[PDB]
Amino acid sequence: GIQGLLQFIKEASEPIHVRKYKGQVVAVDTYCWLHKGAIACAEKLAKGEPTDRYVGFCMKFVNMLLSHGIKPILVFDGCTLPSKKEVERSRRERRQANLLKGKQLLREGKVSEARECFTRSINITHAMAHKVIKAARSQGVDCLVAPYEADAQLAYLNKAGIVQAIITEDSDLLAFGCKKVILKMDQFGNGLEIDQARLGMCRQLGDVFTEEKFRYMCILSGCDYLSSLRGIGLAKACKVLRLANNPDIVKVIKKIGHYLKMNITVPEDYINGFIRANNTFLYQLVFDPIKRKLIPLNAYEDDVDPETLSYAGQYVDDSIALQIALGNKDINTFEQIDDYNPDTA
DNA sequence: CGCTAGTCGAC
DNA sequence: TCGACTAGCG
Ligand SMILES: [Mn+2]
Ligand SMILES: [Mn+2]
Questions:
Q1: Burial class of residue A315 (count of CB atoms within 10 Å of its CB; 0-12, 13-18, 19+)
Q2: Could you say which of 3.40.50.1010, 2.40.50.140, 2.30.30.90, 3.30.420.40 is the CATH number of the domain covering A1-206?
Q3: Is the CB of A10 under 7 A from strand C?
Q4: Fewer CB within 10 Å of terminal CB in chain A, N or C?
Q5: What is the whole-number distance in angstroms between the Cα of residue A218 and the centre of ligand 1?
């Protein structure tokens, strides 16, 4: 989420072209593309009608990257985090309801008005994503399925030096601490890049240009792991961390009302929630594309009990994690739906 | 007036 | 999983 993040730090963005990273590797939040591609074929999908138009839409961007001589790494989402295990399934029940608003309008004469309700009732299943994987693999493009949120997986790849930048429309990658995030990129290669070190150009930020504070701000402004206090967005969240300088974030959150002259009592559920939200941005389970094992996004710091971070992702035997990352074992049924072999073919 | 939170339209 | 436009509203 981090609503309005891009604008809040517009002073850190720079119009660039994909050709910039020619000869280098770039990870991609494939969903961003896969989703847009689902729009061009919303009705056919919402009617069982076989359509692969979203498969071509994704390749349209991939080929555009390859033409500029770049090594694209398509990343996909795997399992679901308990942080939002309920708010994500709420989309399912809210989708099937919208599924009827698209049929009823077609039963009144309104055609285009119903063609829009289908777009608002789209669901990106792992079956669809798999078709995109098959298409990319044949072209020689590497695909990797994150154990949980592609966000964390992408972040790791960049922080690890494996990829130099990350293509996405989701600003959360910034919160995770990505060095180079390419946003709003079209089919021609025109996008808006945000560099972490170039964040200090935003005067409005002030002293919150460090990874630790910047992450704290995103959480306070309202994230996917925790909603912001009623009446607290970016400007407010930034001001709080800006005035205070005590590393003890817990004590700061308690006196949040004091720093803002607003007396909004903080519930105990928020103090605990901020801890979880912070630990999810820090130690969410990713996947090592080299040693082929299941590791956390970052190394556990001093004050953290790894045996209490279940909401960040459950650990699984490396042999199983490898099959999930290769998109061979269904996330849901946990059965082998493919036999792709990287070592050989 | 600056900020936050609401729904809305188009791609 | 987005921004845009606008409102009340501290
Ligand atoms: Mn995501
Ligand atoms: Mn996200």
A1: middle
A2: 3.40.50.1010
A3: no
A4: C
A5: 15
